Design a protein around this ligand. Structure first.
Ligand SMILES: Nc1ncnc2c1ncn2[C@@H]1O[C@H](COP(=O)(O)OP(=O)(O)OP(=O)(O)O)[C@@H](O)[C@H]1O
Ligand code: SF4
Ligand code: SF4
Lengths: 608, 59, 136
């Protein structure tokens, strides 16, 4: 007959105020009219509760809700089979979990809110899964049963017995500074205590990670990239079998994230089990032997797929569709402009834009050098390189925030600027802040697509910025820079705290407005793909981090990309199906052939 | 390509890296066991004679 | 060509006029494909419409699982035999005429493609790329 279906309702309490509506949910529902149970009022917490058993799937309640607090979805009973854990009534529920394997590295990739973080806790022994039920007083026993038919069953027996104690590298990057000071006192102390391994391990681990400078600094003092790496150090130093990493690429620069990936992989060689979660595909590919994909709506649900190969899992990810599950997880496919695709205009505007001379900025501990370059109108320039190179310093000077030690840049131009690390320091609510900058930008349809509808800022409008979240704040900041008119716009590292969909919304944003408005933009980035889409020229930075650095004039996309990628020595041939960068291993004949051609990347362009 | 050179009088060995199609090409259509006079491949190896013994393709 | 064909296609010699039968080269259960129409073909009194490499046709299955017989469906030509000529100057030809049953969007009905597949078809129909072994 007909296929089977279900109803699931998740309500957000933040969005709900029963006083204004009245308990309208109960009154409007047709089941309750009849005298049924579908919506029950909880006198206590004073929240509406919707029971999935009695609900019709009508959706009448959803429309009537004045805010948009209720969500009812109909699924083919895809979710019911898999239930691992649920937070509570009408809240996030997790489905499936990632397999662990000894001697190898298993990847995880998904959009935020999927339960990748939750999954780690369950494997860690930190949290016990309720099984979408009562299971609470240590009922590890029931969890093995639920896992039967899955390879995780063996793991759960091991965890309960406590033969193995997993080491976890904590996920939330913002939270860590508050938790630890010193580790107690200074990063160096942490590394000495934790070092179960070789005395060589202390030195070796620090050298490879580029921690040398950072040892004396305290944890609270650390910058985001530095903060991440110390955590990684402790996860090598520890003695154990299972090493869990949760988002190790966060905050890190392009050079550093690759470095972290290699070191982490070394664990597999000692035949120690490794698990990892990543937002970055370049990093994910290198680390993993096996990959899981986590999909589903954010904060509603997230299911883990069956284990897959490294190459295979990545390929399926980019399609935006999964066949067994039969879900189009992402509404639109990701594509990069060919450069054939772009509009052809004679560019200058007023003959070229402004130009800067050689600049120098010296702190007295770090020195930045800049080579005279030129900027033109309606163009976009990417800035790449490792952090501590003075990528941030350079942008500031152009902003006029910083004064150069030598050189000068006094432009007539009006500048809008977005800072790299965003910490709130503005009193006021989110809507008020954005309205002051510009209203009318808020009216535009473009802004509805990218900001307002996806996150639901309407709910955020009353919330304080101190009270806010990381990724949500990021999209808002990028948009705000665009809020006001300026000849030149400056953005620094827009990719931070953002998942796949979120960054790509940003990529479309910068390119489209700049093209249209005929204004120029400088964007700093670590993400390969984001730079490619937005830019026409690039500046590459080089030197040694935390010591000195150098900048170059803007150069074409092909030219700049070869230089940058030559510093890394990883080529990204091309995958014929995905058109994705495909990484090339060191000493090789195929990779060797490329080195003689000068092609690090490939696109829909002519080339051998 | 990368050359794997052995000096089997001493029991020594080292690798070498040649980029340059023309420097390589001296080895082409040469078979296993064929001798190859050195200077063609470099100035270091001038006079040196090499008997080819095997080796690996990509993959 | 048409729907789901991302890419354009450079002209290649027409090999297969209506009435032609090609080998079915998937694992769908179909043994052959009988061409009744070429998509995107034009009109001239008396001319048979005729397909080539990476053209989408409309076919019936003359030989094959009965659940596939007695009806018209889309297919895509994957191997030719009439020799044609590429822009690198080459005149080339396969040993058989063959295509694979497919949906208007261009998705394979089957999961494998047995034998080789010409690149001009691979380049044209991504789900055909996927299921192809040796290309060209
Ligand atoms: N205390 C809680 N009560 C109810 N639901 C919770 C709670 N903690 C987490 N969740 C739910 O579990 C899901 C989230 O977390 P997890 O921490 O499992 O996410 P991730 O999968 O690691 O995603 P992200 O990439 O955004 O960090 C969320 O969408 C949320 O709805
Ligand atoms: S969820 Fe909406 S309609 Fe229901 S009580 Fe809250 S505000 Fe009123
Ligand atoms: S969807 Fe319909 S049936 Fe279910 S709770 Fe809302 S109104 Fe009641």
């Amino acid at each position: 007959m007909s296929d089977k279906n279900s109803r699931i309702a998740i309500v957000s309490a933040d969005k709900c105020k029963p006083k204004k509506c009245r308990q309208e949910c109960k009154r409007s529902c047709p089941v309750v009219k009849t005298g049924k149970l579908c919506i029950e009022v909880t006198p206590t917490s004073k929240i509406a509760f919707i029971s999935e058993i009695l609900c019709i799937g009508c959706g009448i309640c959803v429309k009537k809700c004045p805010f948009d607090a209720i969500q009812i979805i109909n699924l083919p009973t895809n979710l019911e089979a898999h239930v691992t854990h649920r937070y509570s009534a009408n809240s996030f529920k997790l489905h499936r979990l990632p397999t662990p394997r000894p001697g190898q590295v298993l990847g995880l990739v998904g959009t935020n809110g999927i339960g990748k973080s939750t999954a780690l806790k369950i494997l860690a022994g930190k949290q016990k899964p309720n099984l979408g039920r009562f299971d609470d007083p240590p009922e590890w026993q029931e969890i093995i049963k639920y896992f039967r038919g899955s390879e995780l069953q063996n793991y759960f027996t091991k965890m309960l017995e406590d033969d193995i104690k997993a080491i976890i590298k904590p996920q939330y990057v913002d939270n860590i500074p508050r938790a630890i000071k010193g580790p107690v006192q200074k990063v160096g102390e942490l590394l000495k205590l934790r070092m179960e391994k070789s005395p060589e391990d202390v030195k070796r681990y620090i050298k490879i990670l580029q921690l040398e400078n950072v040892l004396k600094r305290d944890i609270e003092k650390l910058s985001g990239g530095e903060l991440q790496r110390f955590a990684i150090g402790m996860s090598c130093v520890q003695e154990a079998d299972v090493y869990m990493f949760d988002e190790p690429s966060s905050y890190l620069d392009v050079k550093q994230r690759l470095n972290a990936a290699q070191i982490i992989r070394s664990l597999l060689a000692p035949t120690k089990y490794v698990i990892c979660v990543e937002h970055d595909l370049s990093v994910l590919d290198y680390l993993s032997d096996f990959v899981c994909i986590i999909y589903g709506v954010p904060s509603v649900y997230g299911v883990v797929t069956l284990p897959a190969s490294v190459r295979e899992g990545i390929n399926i990810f980019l399609d935006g569709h999964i066949p067994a599950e039969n879900l189009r997880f992402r509404t639109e496919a990701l594509q990069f402009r060919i450069a054939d695709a772009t509009e052809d205009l004679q560019n200058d505007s007023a003959s070229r834009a402004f130009s800067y001379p050689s600049l120098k900025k010296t702190q007295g501990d770090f020195v930045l050098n800049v080579e005279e370059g030129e900027f033109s109108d309606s163009e976009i320039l990417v800035m790449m390189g490792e952090n501590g190179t003075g990528k941030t310093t350079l942008i500031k000077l152009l902003a006029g925030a910083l004064k150069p030690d030598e050189g000068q840049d006094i432009p007539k131009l009006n500048v809008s600027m977005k800072p790299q690390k965003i910490a709130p320091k503005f009193p006021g609510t989110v809507r008020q802040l954005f309205f002051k900058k510009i209203r009318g930008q808020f009216l535009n349809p473009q802004f509805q697509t990218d900001v307002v509808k996806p996150l639901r800022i309407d709910d955020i409008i009353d919330q304080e910025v101190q009270h806010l979240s990381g990724g949500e704040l990021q999209r808002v900041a990028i948009v705000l820079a665009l809020g006001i008119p300026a000849d030149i716009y400056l953005i620094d590292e827009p990719s931070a705290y953002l998942d796949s969909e979120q960054r790509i919304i940003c990529s479309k944003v910068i390119r489209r407005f700049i093209l249209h408005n005929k204004k120029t933009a400088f964007i700093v980035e670590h993400d390969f793909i984001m730079a490619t889409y937005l830019a026409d020229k690039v500046i590459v930075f080089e030197g040694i981090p935390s010591k000195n650095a150098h900048a170059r004039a803007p150069e074409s996309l092909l030219t700049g990309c070869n230089r940058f990628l030559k510093n890394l020595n990883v080529t990204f041939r091309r995958d014929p199906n995905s058109f994705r960068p495909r990484i090339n291993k060191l000493d090789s004949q195929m990779d060797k052939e490329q080195k003689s051609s000068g092609n690090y990347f490939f696109l829909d362009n002519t080339g051998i | 390509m990368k050359l794997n050179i052995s000096y089997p009088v001493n029991g020594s060995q080292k690798t070498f890296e040649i980029d340059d199609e023309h420097r390589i090409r001296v080895f082409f259509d040469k078979r296993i066991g064929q001798e190859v006079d050195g200077e063609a491949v470099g100035d270091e190896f001038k006079g040196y004679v090499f008997k080819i013994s095997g080796g690996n393709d990509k993959q | 060509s048409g729907n789901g064909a991302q890419g354009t296609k450079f002209r290649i010699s027409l090999g297969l006029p209506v009435g032609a039968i090609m080998n079915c080269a998937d694992n769908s259960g179909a043994r052959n494909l009988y061409i009744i129409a070429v998509k995107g073909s034009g009109s001239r009194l008396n001319r048979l419409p005729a397909a080539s490499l990476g053209d989408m046709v409309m076919a019936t299955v003359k030989k094959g699982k009965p659940e596939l017989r007695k009806k018209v469906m889309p297919a895509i030509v994957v191997r030719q035999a009439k020799s044609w000529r590429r822009r690198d100057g080459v005149f080339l030809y396969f040993e058989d005429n063959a295509g694979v049953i497919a949906n208007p969007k261009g998705e394979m009905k089957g999961s494998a493609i047995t034998g080789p597949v010409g690149k001009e078809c691979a380049d044209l129909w991504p789900r055909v790329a996927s299921n192809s072994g040796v290309v060209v």
